[PDB]
Design goal:
homodimer; alpha/beta; Rossmann fold; 3-stranded mixed beta sheet; 16 helices; globular; binds the ligand O=C(/C=N/O)NCCCN1CCC[C@H](CCNC(=O)/C=N/O)C1; neurotransmitter degradation (chains A, B); nucleus (chains A, B); cholinesterase activity (chains A, B); protein homodimerization activity (chains A, B); disulfide bond (chains A, B)
């Protein structure tokens, strides 16, 4: 029996587990309940705090994954199945995990809180690439990661009603942040040095917590990897969220024809359906004809968000806030095999021009035909307008710029010019173990394994360069967690990472080569999306 | 007695003059009347052929310049006054000039026919930079240049009427071409090998002869330098030409206060006014403030042009036609000192972004606010959106591409893809004796002095390399006159000039360095003007 694997929190006592690392052990507390299981009549409702428990809750294993769609596009394929649930599904899923070094930190230590992505319809804290044992061992920090309700169970919204207010999946993350405020000290973690970091929808969640006052008091720094709240995929209007919710009810037989009708009989009917039935009809309510659109996302109800994320970013004071932000080199390549014609991970996806013009309508949905022409103009090399290899990478940029890179640069510039110290990066190393095809370059999501030190796992066939490279990135993230500056507070030998400003727009390239400063997060392409495209669609 | 300077033509006898070049003499016949003076009741009417004359018409000096506006922006400045009239103004101006080598060619020789530019409101064949004395000596060709009516006298149009049909200045050029068919043999020139070459509005004139069936039978090859018939300034609608003609009549007091204003009494009132009075109100016919918009241009009437130049180029077969087109490196810089805010030839024109925004409306007139913002999008470096030097060259490209480079590249593409062998160039040498400021680069029109071999004039301070460079250019132009191919037929040793195709889009840079092949006549920028902007203006 180790005295360090025993911890008492406000709810009760826990028994953790000792994880091994090629550089020393780590104490892990996997599966801590932080809310009452949102089951039965509590479905679609905001979370309630987990009531205290007698005895010693076992905290040696990941708990269940929240009910979610399982990707079946490429069965057996590692590149897709690494994001699928690796524990069984359940609505009883509101559990968080806490890693802490060995020996336990004696003085208060900075805390990193991870928020998984997955388009607000999937994801789990238990995925092998979110293993925090390597980041906690090498940098002596405290890492926390929670599970939040995805899909309809987390974001079905009948706005105005109290049976389904929406954004309850965001409140789940908030409750885990409130839990960290009250209990991370028991693990050696400093509740006054909390750094949120998430990827994709997780990064969009981090941004929505920057713009929600009740969440701002629970953390002090932010890291948004390949995502932002102002993206065209991360929010939905009240009327549209109502239309999608009523559609889901109809697809599962609600209301029982004919009874109606009001929001209180609809949610009551939805609460009687098995969870898998609700998931079986999730991709069945939206326009049905576009990659990158997710059915149940955060709604702008006026509650969690007083206004749209774009408005709150513009009219917001960000002094005293430090933000690390960045993207990958090829954000859109992995999304093109999910509907874009001519694309297939098992060939070269050398699309024709007809497929390119059709792929733009799928990558950029709900736009006028005139607006589609402007995208084709901006993204065509008119010296080689029919080269398949160039058309493939253009559509990869069309989708990458519209969904990730330009919503991120817009946010980053607006933050720096309004008081926030901002640092920017672009991940430009393709893992030597990557299972996706070569033409996808560095796809969306494949920087996470390096931020979490996964190359240090001796069972994985990573190179010596990637091992040293992962240690560099872990120091960048941890230094930003400790000081708010990814540069070491003393080392002048390592190249300097200059802050990102709305004018200079400086960022660094993260790869095996030393740091290199560059200007412009695709400045030309993003001027089309952020500046010109709204002016057109105003004049339909 | 030198019987060389004595030539008889179908109309009578002429006596010429011997001009000296550093490499030999040349026989010149300057001032040959090819039409009855279009004065009195013949003003605004199509030209009548010159009736035969008794005696020996003197042909040793240039005749009068057609009545035209005189540029007074920079008095005494070489850069502007080199294009101003250098003979007395008169409506008696329909005269042409013929240079021929000494000794006179015995076998038929190919002939170049020059059509001067000047926005259809100015220009004259007598300008020093159009001196054919060097092109004829060095290449043993026949050069012919005529005068045509400009301004209201050449292009005032009350369409459909008999008194002012319009395009009579283009008919003046046609008449000089029919005269070349009937009399060029007398000078040693082959009427079955005549190649038109013009610049700016002259280049647009050459193109309008390709698209007019009666003119097409009078020449075999075409050269268009920095101008094309499909430009936004080269033509005007039928109803707008009527509006401009009636406005000019009002400004000079026509019709008198109390009489009707039908077409036959309007022109009768215009014919009684002194020519200088019509010229003094030519620019008040456009109340709009805009660089590059000229008051009286060729009208699309159905007579000289059965449809618009853009329509005829699209539906035309050009097999058996050799074309040589090209532009200068900085087409629009010469015109920004003519109304663009913040621009002055005597400072650096480091304009502010406000001035760049205002200048776009003046360089691209008659476009919606939504269309101007698209131009600002395409032509702004968004990493340096306020750098004055970059904004200056941006506006220089905006104006140069909209008015010259893209209408030409559009024409060059449709020609090659429909039968015509096309060669393309970009003039990139700035004259060592150029008087315009350094920041204008190679302005519009400053390749002409090298095509005409003016650097060989011993009275000028050109460099030795410009002498050799001018000789090389004259060889290209004459070869294309003989062969239809600017490359020397007896030499694979020199760098080769590949044709211009609608796909490869190859051109060469003409400068002191040897030939260099490049691809794309500013293809990215021209896709905005030729492809997207019509789609934008169609949806209003
Ligand atoms: O990454 C992303 C999206 N980016 O946009 N993943 C989306 C996963 C796919 N999804 C949407 C497309 C439709 C599909 C359901 C089809 N399933 C069947 O069984 C059909 N039988 O006809 C679920
Ligand atoms: O090359 C180009 C075209 N670029 O578009 N030249 C344009 C010809 C110049 N023109 C501009 C507008 C009219 C103005 C006449 C005013 N003259 C006065 O004396 C007024 N006193 O109030 C001179």
């Amino acid at each position: 029996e180790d005295a360090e694997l025993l911890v008492t929190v406000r709810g009760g006592r826990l028994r953790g587990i000792r994880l091994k690392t090629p550089g020393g052990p780590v104490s892990a507390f996997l599966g801590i309940p932080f809310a009452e299981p949102p089951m039965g009549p509590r479905r679609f409702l905001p979370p309630e705090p987990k009531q205290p428990w007698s005895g010693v809750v076992d905290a040696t294993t990941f708990q269940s994954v929240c009910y979610q769609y399982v990707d079946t596009l490429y069965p057996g394929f590692e590149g897709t199945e690494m994001w699928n649930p690796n524990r069984e599904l359940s609505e009883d899923c509101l559990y968080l995990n806490v890693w802490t070094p060995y020996p336990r930190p004696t003085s208060p230590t900075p805390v990193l809180v991870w928020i998984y992505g997955g388009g607000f319809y999937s994801g789990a804290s238990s995925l092998d690439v979110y293993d925090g044992r390597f980041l906690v061992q090498a940098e002596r920090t405290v890492l926390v990661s929670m599970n939040y309700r995805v899909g309809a169970f987390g974001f079905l919204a009948l706005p105005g009603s109290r049976e389904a207010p929406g954004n309850v999946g965001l409140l789940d993350q908030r409750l885990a942040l409130q839990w960290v405020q009250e209990n991370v000290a028991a693990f050696g973690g400093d509740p006054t040095s909390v750094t949120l970091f998430g990827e994709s929808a997780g990064a969009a969640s981090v941004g929505m917590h920057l713009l929600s006052p009740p969440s701002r008091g629970l953390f002090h720094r932010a890291v948004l990897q390949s995502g932002a709240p102002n993206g065209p995929w991360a929010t939905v209007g009240m009327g549209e969220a109502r239309r999608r919710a009523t559609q889901l009810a109809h697809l599962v037989g609600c209301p029982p024809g004919g009874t109606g009708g009001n929001d209180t009989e609809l949610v009551a009917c939805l609460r009687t359906r098995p969870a898998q039935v609700l998931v079986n009809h999730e991709w069945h309510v939206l326009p049905q004809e576009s990659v990158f659109r997710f059915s149940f996302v955060p709604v702008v109800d006026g509650d969690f968000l007083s206004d749209t994320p774009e408005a709150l970013i513009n009219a917001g004071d960000f002094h005293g806030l430090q933000v690390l932000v960045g993207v990958v080199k090829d954000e859109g390549s992995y999304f093109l095999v999910y509907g874009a014609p001519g694309f297939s991970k098992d060939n070269e996806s050398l699309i024709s021009r007809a497929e390119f013009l059709a792929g733009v309508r799928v990558g950029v949905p709900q736009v006028s035909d005139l607006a589609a022409e402007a995208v084709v103009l901006h993204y065509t090399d008119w010296l080689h307008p029919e080269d398949p290899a160039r058309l493939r990478e253009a559509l990869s940029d069309v989708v990458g710029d519209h969904n990730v890179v330009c919503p991120v640069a817009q946010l980053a510039g607006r933050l720096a010019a309004q008081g926030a110290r901002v640092y920017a990066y672009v991940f430009e190393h393709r893992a030597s173990t990557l299972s996706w095809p070569l033409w996808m370059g560095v796809p969306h999501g494949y920087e996470i394994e390096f931020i979490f030190g996964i190359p240090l796992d001796p069972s994985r066939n990573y190179t010596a360069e990637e091992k040293i490279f992962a240690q560099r990135l872990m120091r960048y993230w941890a230094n930003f967690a400790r000081t708010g500056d990814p540069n070491e507070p003393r080392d002048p030998k390592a190249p300097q990472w200059p802050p990102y400003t709305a004018g200079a727009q400086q960022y660094v390239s993260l790869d095996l080569r030393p740091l290199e400063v560059r200007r412009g997060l695709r400045a030309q392409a993003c001027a089309f999306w952020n500046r010109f495209l709204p002016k057109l669609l105003s004049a339909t």
